[PDB]
Design an enzyme around this catalytic site. Structure first.
Site, short mmCIF file in Angstrom:
data_model
loop_
_atom_site.label_atom_id
_atom_site.label_comp_id
_atom_site.label_asym_id
_atom_site.label_seq_id
_atom_site.Cartn_x
_atom_site.Cartn_y
_atom_site.Cartn_z
N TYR C 155 0.80 -1.27 0.02
CA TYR C 155 -0.10 -0.03 0.03
C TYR C 155 0.81 1.12 0.04
O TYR C 155 0.77 2.16 -0.68
CB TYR C 155 -0.83 -0.07 1.04
CG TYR C 155 -1.78 1.21 1.05
CD1 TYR C 155 -2.63 1.49 0.12
CD2 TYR C 155 -1.70 2.10 2.14
CE1 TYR C 155 -3.50 2.67 0.22
CE2 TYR C 155 -2.51 3.13 2.24
CZ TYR C 155 -3.40 3.35 1.29
OH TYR C 155 -3.94 4.55 1.45
N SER C 156 2.03 1.19 0.94
CA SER C 156 2.86 2.49 0.98
C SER C 156 3.76 2.58 -0.19
O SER C 156 4.06 3.58 -0.65
CB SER C 156 3.77 1.98 2.24
OG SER C 156 2.95 1.93 3.36
#
Ligand code: NAP
Ligand code: NAP
Ligand code: NAP
Ligand code: NAP
Lengths: 240, 240, 240, 240
Positions: C155-156
Site C-alpha cells: 500500500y505504501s
C-alpha cells in the site's frame, strides 16, 4: 599523509568514539570542549598509527561564540584542517511553556550559533587551498530534527537548523572541494540519554545504539568523495 | 561463516561493483540477471577470500514476476540469504505524453513489481530464522525519487515506490532482525548514462560518480546493525 | 464557463466529498468508479449552481489499465478536462510474507499503474491547450507514503510511487500550465478505516478526520496557481 | 465573536497581505514590527467587517528577545490570541566566509531566537484555555529551508530551525488544541526579492509569486482543524 581533523565534544560520548576511529585511520585529531583534564586523558589514549601524526586539545566553551569564531586558544590555525566534525551539543527536555530562558538560549548557542561561527572560520581558512580530494564538514544532528516529539522544541529547532545550514553549505562549497553532511543518531548509550530509554520511542530496532555505530558513519563519510548535502541516519529506525 | 548475498543486476555497472565488494568482504554472492554469458564472466572474477565461500549465477528475467517470486531457476532457496540487494532496473526518458505503454509498464514491472515479489519470497523464507546480527535488504533507488525532473515520470514513480516499500518494511521487519534501506545514486558512469550526463544537472560536485562509490554505501550498510528505514544518497549533491 | 473535473472514486468517501465541493464551486464533475448505480445516485445529488454546469458518470474499473489509458466508456474525451483528481484506491493490511499475490498486484495496479495511464491520457490531451490559469492534477496519497508502518508494504509502495510521479510531473508540466500535487489523508472516517482506529497511531490530534477536511485541501489547491510539486498533508499530525 | 490574531511583520509584504485577509475574515488583527507609523497606516486600512472587531499595533523589534518573550509594549495580553502568525524576517545573501558576524547573528536572532520566545509566551498563556476548535500557530518559512542554495547558509539555517520547532511543537501541543504548521514561500514580489529574480531559480512555474498567494495558504490553515506538523509550500515548484 596524516591530515588534521577537528572534533568538537571529543572528551566523551560520540565525539570520543569519532576521535578514536579517526586516529586509528591516521588522522591527527584536535579535540575541543570545556573539560581540559578529560580532553588530556582522551588525547593520551588516541592511537598513533602513522609517522607525523599528532593529537591536540583545545579548551573551548561553545557558549562563547566569539571565542569559537576566532579560534581563540586553538592549538592549530583553522587553515590546518581537512576534516571538521561538529559534534558537541546539549539536549534539554521541557514543555516549551516551562523551558527556562537561560537554558534554551544556551542550548541554541552551543548547538547552532557557535557551530556556524566555527564553520565560517574553517571555510574562510580552507576554501581556496588546493586539494586532491575533498575536505569534509560533518555535523552531528539527531532524529528529532526530522521527526517531531513533545518536550524537545528548542533542541529540535537547534538541530534542524544545523540540517538547513548543511544543505546550503553543501551547494555553496561543493565547487570548492568541500563536502558537507550530517550524521543523525538515535538514542545512544551516552550521558545525554540519562533518564531516557529506547522504549519511550516507537523503534523498529528496540534497543540502545552504541557510540561505535555513530563513529562508523562518520568514518564512512570522511572516506567518501561523492556524498554531499545528505544525512546518514543511525537511529534504529526512529525516522522511518 | 560465508553468508549468502543475492544481487540482482549483478552482471554490469553498479550491481557488478556491489557484487565485487561483497565478495571481497567474504559473502557468497548469487548474481541474478538475463545475460548468462556476462553473469558467468563476472562470477569468475568475484574474489574468494574465506574457506567455503562460493558464488552463483541465476538467469532471471525480472519482467517475469512469477519466476522472480517463486525463485524459479535459482541456485539456492530464498531461505539461504542474509543479504538481498535489489539493484536491477531500467531507466527510460520520455515526456509522459509520448511514453510508449509497453515500455513504461515493463519498466514499472522490473523496477517495482519484481522487487516486491522477490522481497516477499526472501522475507517469508527468513523471517523466523534465528540470527545473531540483522539480515539486510537494500534497494538501489535514485536521486530522482526524491527531487523531480522532467521526462522521468514513470522512472521516478517506480523508484519512489521502492522507497515507500523500504520504509514500511523497515517498520515491519526491524523486530524480526531484518534491516531495510535504500542507496540512492546520482549520475553514475554506467550504460544508463547513455542518454544523460552530469552537466544536464545543477551539481554541487561536477562530474561522474564511479560505480565503486555506490558499492561503498552498500558495503557500509551491510556491515551496519543500527541503520534501518533510511536512504544513503551518493549523488554528488543532486538532492541537496 | 463551467470547467470540467474528473474525480476517480467519486462514488463514496473522500472522492464523493471532493466531487460535492467542486460541484458547489461550479465545476462540471465526472465521477468514475466501478459502481454505476452508486455513481448515478451521487451524480443526482451533486449541486448545480450555474448555467452550463453538467455532471457525468464513468463506469471504470482501474484494474483495467488499457480501459483507463484509452478513456474507454468515458462520457467526455480527455481533452475536456481542466482538473483531474486521482482519488480511487484500495488499501490492504497484511504482513508482506502473507500478502496474497493476486491481492497486492491488484492494489498496485489500481493505485499506481492505472493512475499513470489516466494521467498520460489527460496530459496528452491538454498539454498544448491554451490556458489563462493552470490546469490541476491532484493525487490522493496517504501519510503512510512518507512515514512507514507495519503491515502496509505494498500500500505504501503504491502511494509513494504516486508521490514520485507527482514531483516529476510537476517539473515536466509547470511550463505547460499544469500544476500537480498530492493531498495526503490520515485516518479518515471511511470504509477503508473499518477495523483500524486513530488510536492505533501515535497522533497529535487524537480522533477521526472527516472527509470534508480532505476535500477542503483539494478545493484550496484547485483555486491555487503557485502551488506545484507538493503534498498538502491532512493527517492529524501523523507525519509530524 | 471576533477572535484575535497576532501577525509579526504586518507592516508590509507578505505579512500585510496575511493581515488583510484575516481582517476580511473577521479577525481582530494585532500587527507587530518596528515601523510604528507604517503599522498605523496598515491598521487604518484593515477591513472592519463584524461588530466587535478591533485592530491593534505593537511596536516590537525582534532583535530584542527579552522584549518579545515578555510581550513588552503589547496592546493585548498573550492570552488573548487564537492565531499567531510568525512572519517577520530578514534575508541576507553572502558567501559564508564573508558573512559579517553582526549581520548573520542578528538574522538568526530575528528569524529563530525571537520567534521561539514569542511562541513560548503565547503557548504559556493559552495552553490551558478552553477551546471549541484549535488555536493556530503558523510560521512563515522559505523553500530554502528544505532545498539548499549557495550564499544563504545562515538564512537557511534560521528557517530550517523554525521548521524543526514547528514539528516538535505540533506533537507537544496537538493534545492541548493548538495546531502548528509552516507556510513556505518561494520568490515572492516583495522588498526581499529586490536584487534576486525568479529566473535565477530553476522553476517549474517561471514567474513571480504574489503576496496574496501566500496569504491564501495561511487562510486555509487558520480555517483547518486536522492539519498540524506540516508545511504548505507556495513556491512555484522550487522544492519539487
Ligand atoms: C547529538 O549528538 C552529539 C553527541 O552527543 P553525545 O550523546 O555524545 O553527548 P555527550 O556524551 O553529552 O557529550 C557532549 C559533548 O559535548 C561537549 N560539550 C557540551 N557542552 C559544551 C560547550 N558549552 N562547549 C564545548 N563543548 C561542549 C561535552 O564536553 P565538555 O563537557 O568537556 O565541554 C561533550 O564532549 C550532540 O551534539 C547531540 O545533541
Ligand atoms: C539505479 O541504479 C541501479 C543500477 O543501475 P546501473 O546504472 O548499474 O544500470 P545498468 O548498468 O544499465 O545495469 C542494469 C542491470 O539490471 C539488469 N537488468 C536489466 N533488465 C533486467 C531484467 N528484465 N531482468 C533482470 N535483470 C535486468 C541488467 O542485466 P541484464 O541485461 O544481464 O539482464 C544489468 O545487470 C538501477 O536500478 C538504476 O535504476
Ligand atoms: N487515502 C487514500 O484516499 C483515497 C480515497 O480513500 P477513501 O477512504 O475515500 O476510500 P473508500 O471510501 O474505500 O473509497 C474508495 C473509492 O475508490 C473506488 N475504487 C476502488 N477500487 C476501484 C477500482 N478497481 N476501479 C475504480 N474505482 C475503484 C471506489 O468505488 P467503486 O467501489 O464504486 O469502484 C470508491 O469510490 C484512496 O485512494 C486511499 O488509498
Ligand atoms: C520568509 O517570508 C517572510 C515575510 O517576508 P516578506 O518577503 O514579506 O519580507 P519583507 O517584505 O522584507 O517584510 C519583512 C517584514 O518583517 C518585519 N521585520 C523585519 N525585521 C524585523 C525586526 N527586527 N523586528 C520586527 N519586525 C521585523 C518588517 O517590518 P519593520 O521593517 O516594520 O520592522 C516587515 O514587515 C519573512 O520571514 C521571510 O524570511
Amino acid at each position: 599523509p596524516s591530515l588534521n581533523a577537528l572534533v568538537t565534544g571529543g572528551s566523551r560520548g560520540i565525539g570520543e568514539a569519532i576521535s578514536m576511529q579517526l586516529a586509528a585511520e591516521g588522522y591527527s585529531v584536535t579535540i575541543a570542549s570545556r573539560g581540559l583534564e578529560q580532553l588530556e586523558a582522551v588525547k593520551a589514549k588516541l592511537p598513533i598509527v602513522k609517522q607525523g601524526q599528532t593529537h591536540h586539545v583545545w579548551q573551548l566553551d561553545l557558549s562563547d561564540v566569539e571565542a569559537a569564531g576566532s579560534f581563540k586558544g586553538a592549538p592549530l590555525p583553522a587553515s590546518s584542517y581537512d576534516v571538521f566534525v561538529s559534534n558537541a551539543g546539549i539536549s534539554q527536555f521541557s514543555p516549551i511553556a516551562e523551558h527556562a530562558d537561560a537554558d534554551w538560549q544556551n542550548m541554541l548557542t552551543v548547538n547552532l550559533t557557535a557551530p556556524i561561527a566555527l564553520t565560517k572560520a574553517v571555510v574562510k581558512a580552507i576554501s581556496d587551498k588546493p586539494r586532491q580530494t575533498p575536505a569534509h564538514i560533518i555535523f552531528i544532528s539527531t532524529g528529532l530534527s526530522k521527526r517531531g516529539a513533545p518536550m524537545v522544541g528548542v533542541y529540535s529547532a537547534s538541530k534542524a537548523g544545523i540540517d538547513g545550514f548543511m544543505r546550503s553549505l553543501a551547494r555553496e562549497l561543493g565547487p570548492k572541494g568541500i563536502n558537507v553532511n550530517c550524521v543523525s543518531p538515535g538514542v545512544t548509550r551516552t550521558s545525554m540519554a540519562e533518564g531516557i530509554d529506547p522504549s519511550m520511542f516507537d523503534l523498529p530496532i528496540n534497543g540502545w545504539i552504541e557510540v561505535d555505530a555513530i563513529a562508523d558513519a562518520v568514518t564512512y563519510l570522511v572516506k567518501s568523495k561523492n556524498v554531499t548535502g545528505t544525512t546518514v541516519s543511525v537511529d534504529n529506525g526512529y525516522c522511518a
